Write a protein that binds this ligand. Structure first.
Ligand SMILES: [Ca+2]
Length: 355
């Protein structure tokens, strides 16, 4: 009978006590697996009939199903002296490297499937896991977070690839299992961890097709606390004038990132809509993969870290710029590429953004 939910509580005041919130859910034979820190809500398991009675309880604002998100990136092509994947030059990160700016002391949370900390071309500084039976964030079960982390911060050294912001402080925030999928509640926990740990930048190369009140809250909270939040638009293509952008990219607080190829063409699979903000390379993106290798993937998942790393570049040159200034620079120096339904403000140009 039981399904997975998020139970949102009316704002002030009760509800705000921890114990009371347990009760409202207990006394409908519900079970609570987590009360969020920044969202006035709890992740709960519930059956059919408790729901209708929860919805009736005057202290409850909503009951929504705890949704599924997934990584927006796929394998495309699968020792070596260091090369620079094209995307990095496309967004003009090298110009920042040449002024000595590479993202140092910038804290970036990779909210994904984990990051392979043993990879020689990555440096992971910390993290946590919110996937209940896959508790080590340094074991990237699906290989996706490792690839995303390489675009952001692959070491500038003698091997493999180079990240947009190669000296950025990388954090693995595991919220997708082996299968490349996560409950919305695990993602929320991931984001909450990033807030409490003072990340400067959040990267989410993942998404789901359904909205969530608790999800909006927490992404809004992160941005409100001064964190730059980049989210992949999704890979669902177009569909007339209907927006196909995924959540949380769909929320205006996040920078929604779509995919262009090396010719600056909107990629095929690249979700479109008015919630699109900027574009970045997501076709044939070379990066780090677990077990010490490299490989190319396609996805708005691979475009997003370009933006996340760009933000880290900008912050390493301009440490007093807040997320709003970084976001503004990125969007308002972007390179116009066509209709904003399709391209947003266009291709990010970290060189121009960082002037
Ligand atoms: Ca390298």
């Amino acid at each position: 009978t039981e399904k997975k939910y998020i139970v949102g509580f009316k704002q002030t005041m009760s509800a705000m006590s921890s114990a009371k919130k347990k009760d409202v859910i207990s006394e409908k034979g519900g079970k609570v697996q987590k009360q969020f820190k920044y969202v006035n809500a709890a992740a709960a398991t519930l059956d059919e009939k408790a729901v209708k009675e929860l919805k009736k309880d005057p202290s409850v604002a909503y009951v929504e199903e705890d949704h599924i998100a997934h990584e927006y990136g796929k394998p495309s092509w699968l020792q070596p002296a260091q090369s620079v994947p094209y995307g990095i030059s496309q967004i003009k990160a090298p110009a920042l490297h040449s002024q000595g700016y590479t993202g140092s002391n910038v804290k970036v949370a990779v909210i994904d499937s984990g990051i392979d900390s043993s990879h020689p071309d990555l440096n992971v500084r910390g993290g946590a896991s919110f996937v209940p039976s896959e508790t080590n964030p340094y074991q990237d079960g699906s290989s996706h977070g490792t690839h995303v982390a390489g675009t952001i911060a692959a070491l500038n050294n003698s091997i493999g690839v180079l990240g947009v912001s190669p000296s950025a402080s990388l954090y693995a925030v595991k919220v997708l299992d082996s299968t490349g999928s996560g409950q919305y509640s695990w993602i929320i926990n991931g984001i909450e961890w990033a807030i409490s740990n003072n990340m400067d930048v959040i990267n989410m190369s993942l998404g789901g097709p359904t909205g969530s009140t608790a999800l909006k809250t927490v992404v809004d909270k992160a941005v409100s606390s001064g964190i730059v939040v980049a989210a992949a638009a999704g890979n669902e293509g177009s569909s007339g004038s209907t927006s196909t952008v995924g959540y949380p990219a769909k929320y205006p607080s996040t920078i929604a990132v779509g995919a262009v190829n090396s010719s600056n063409q909107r990629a095929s699979f690249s979700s479109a809509g008015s919630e699109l903000d900027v574009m970045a390379p997501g076709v044939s993106i070379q990066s780090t993969l677990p077990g010490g290798t490299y490989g190319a993937y396609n996805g708005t998942a691979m475009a997003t870290p370009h933006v996340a790393g760009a933000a880290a570049l900008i912050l390493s040159k301009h440490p007093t710029w807040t997320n709003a200034q970084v976001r503004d620079r990125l969007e308002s120096t972007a390179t116009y590429l066509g209709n904003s339904f399709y391209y947003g403000k266009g291709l990010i140009n970290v060189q121009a953004a960082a002037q």
